[PDB]
Amino acid sequence: SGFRKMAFPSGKVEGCMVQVTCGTTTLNGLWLDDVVYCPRHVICTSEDMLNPNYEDLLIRKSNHNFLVQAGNVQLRVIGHSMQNCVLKLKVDTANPKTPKYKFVRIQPGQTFSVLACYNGSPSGVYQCAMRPNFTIKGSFLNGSCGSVGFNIDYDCVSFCYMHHMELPTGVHAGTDLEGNFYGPFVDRQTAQAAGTDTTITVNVLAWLYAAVINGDRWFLNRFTTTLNDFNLVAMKYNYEPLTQDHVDILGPLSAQTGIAVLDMCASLKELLQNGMNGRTILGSALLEDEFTPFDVVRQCSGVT
Amino acid sequence: SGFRKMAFPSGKVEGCMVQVTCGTTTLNGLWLDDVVYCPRHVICTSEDMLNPNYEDLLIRKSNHNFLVQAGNVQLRVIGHSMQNCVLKLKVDTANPKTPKYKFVRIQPGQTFSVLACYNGSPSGVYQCAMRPNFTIKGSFLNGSCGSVGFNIDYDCVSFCYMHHMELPTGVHAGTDLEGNFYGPFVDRQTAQAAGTDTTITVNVLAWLYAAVINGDRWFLNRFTTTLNDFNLVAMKYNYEPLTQDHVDILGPLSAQTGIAVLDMCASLKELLQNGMNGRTILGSALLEDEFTPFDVVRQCSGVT
Ligand SMILES: O=C(c1cc(=O)[nH]c2ccccc12)N1CCN(c2ccccc2)CC1
Numbered sequence A, B: 001s002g003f004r005k006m007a008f009p010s011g012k013v014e015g016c017m018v019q020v021t022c023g024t025t026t027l028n029g030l031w032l033d034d035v036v037y038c039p040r041h042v043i044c045t046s047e048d049m050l051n052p053n054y055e056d057l058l059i060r061k062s063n064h065n066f067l068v069q070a071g072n073v074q075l076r077v078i079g080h081s082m083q084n085c086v087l088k089l090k091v092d093t094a095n096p097k098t099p100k101y102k103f104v105r106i107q108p109g110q111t112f113s114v115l116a117c118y119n120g121s122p123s124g125v126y127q128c129a130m131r132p133n134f135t136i137k138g139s140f141l142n143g144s145c146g147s148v149g150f151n152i153d154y155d156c157v158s159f160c161y162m163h164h165m166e167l168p169t170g171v172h173a174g175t176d177l178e179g180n181f182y183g184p185f186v187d188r189q190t191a192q193a194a195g196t197d198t199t200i201t202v203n204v205l206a207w208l209y210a211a212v213i214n215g216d217r218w219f220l221n222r223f224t225t226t227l228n229d230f231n232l233v234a235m236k237y238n239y240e241p242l243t244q245d246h247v248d249i250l251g252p253l254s255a256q257t258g259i260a261v262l263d264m265c266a267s268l269k270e271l272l273q274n275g276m277n278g279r280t281i282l283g284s285a286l287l288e289d290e291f292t293p294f295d296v297v298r299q300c301s302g303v304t
């Protein structure tokens, strides 16, 4: 019992964090095999950050201008290439601590752990959701760039995110491990509009299921609804519309609790229309949307 | 920018998690050097859990009856002793992954990370506070016993907690690494009263300071208060009384923001008396008390 915002154990990922220095700028890198991945803005100066020509900038750079250090051992860089918004620095040594790994592009509404790093060292790990507008509500300071997001399936690490920037609005933007940004973001120190953000309805419902499993049942009511009626309420409250796929992904939680998904939707509809009324669900005075049905099932079943 | 419930990176602690089996019962253990620590209730059966004579129970047990496995290698047990509510099983092999470590007894109001484990494997890591009533609001299922709580100072792991039980009320109780329970709890399947719990006032104030640092300033007001007046309000709202020590621990955050601690107390007094009024502070619709002034400073300065 008990429901916490749980991150994945970060060990396999800590063994991949390195420090990448280029000129005066320093950020973090991911060392997997004989390649170190990092944001390409490591080759920038605080004059060209407004609009940098990364092609012309990387041309001024040689392998020896890229210092890669893992803990205390300096790594020898033998190659450099730009792939979208990331640099891949070939090192003459494979990482002995390289776990089984995949480079995946997650969807909005999906969750992952972030291992926040400064100078190649881990400072902390937290659980995040990729907001529908492709931003993350992280905790990142100067030097945090290159920090990665990931998930762990048994022994496999699925690298899904690499941190590149903080928007002036306080939210975080970054790329997948191929350098393609999530959202309309580009790597320039320019004001960038993060789209309108909605609430991940399927996650809010999964977290309602986690609350029923863990004893909080005040929100459960004598009503049911339809997908179309519930979506009228969801649209007014800036909530993502619920599809039949979402109802199918909620199947296991509905079976485990005996509460049909549309009955749960009706409880959420009254939580949206009437509020929490000063009450709490799983220690929270608001509707939590950063736990997918997979997270709720894994945490309420102890998958290692 | 951004403020998250951040746990410590769990790597050094994952390298210490083992599986301890004794009869039919299996739980987790902490392998540091040539000793594996685990809750003593591993020698119990579901008949004697009501009131077990652990001395008579451990007498029926031999070294070979204690199976210790780390990943896939079976460890050879050469000694067994009971220290309060934990067993120390001497193994003929030291843990190669033993980090620099201390066994510390934390105070209520202090925070730590929990690496939740099942069968010696890590499933997730989360940030906790030791409630003033010595319980923790964790997330633990069957097999989670032996999961440890810790903090990390550079490379040193301070083991502060070991999980033993869940109270019927949903909260978690356990011991320090010496087997002494935090609180009035004993290791029996009996209904145990967790004392009345209060809110950690000094942490709520530190989290108000974290909110000012990260841009949320709606709660700041044109008032100041006295320690004695603020404590009248704190007592009514089941909040821990604020001492001069708490005002001194809040010194650094007060200096970093230019808001005197008693001015911050006055804002908290109006948050307690008038509520949040449907607003949020750091994405939360309630007053967060699981971040100490040390956590807020470390997260708002990036200490690795
Ligand atoms: O170090 C940071 C950074 C990241 C963060 O998430 N939060 C911060 C908060 C305060 C101060 C800095 C940060 N950079 C690095 C320069 N930067 C940048 C430069 C060129 C092209 C694209 C981005 C913006 C992001």
Ligand SMILES: O=C(c1cc(=O)[nH]c2ccccc12)N1CCN(c2ccccc2)CC1
Binding pocket: A001, B041, B044, B049, B140, B141, B142, B143, B144, B145, B164, B165, B166, B172, B186, B187, B188, B189
């Ligand atoms: O495995 C658990 C357990 C721990 C937990 O935190 N949450 C649970 C939720 C559901 C089912 C079990 C648990 N035990 C192990 C037996 N147990 C026990 C037995 C003898 C003496 C002291 C304690 C109580 C705690």
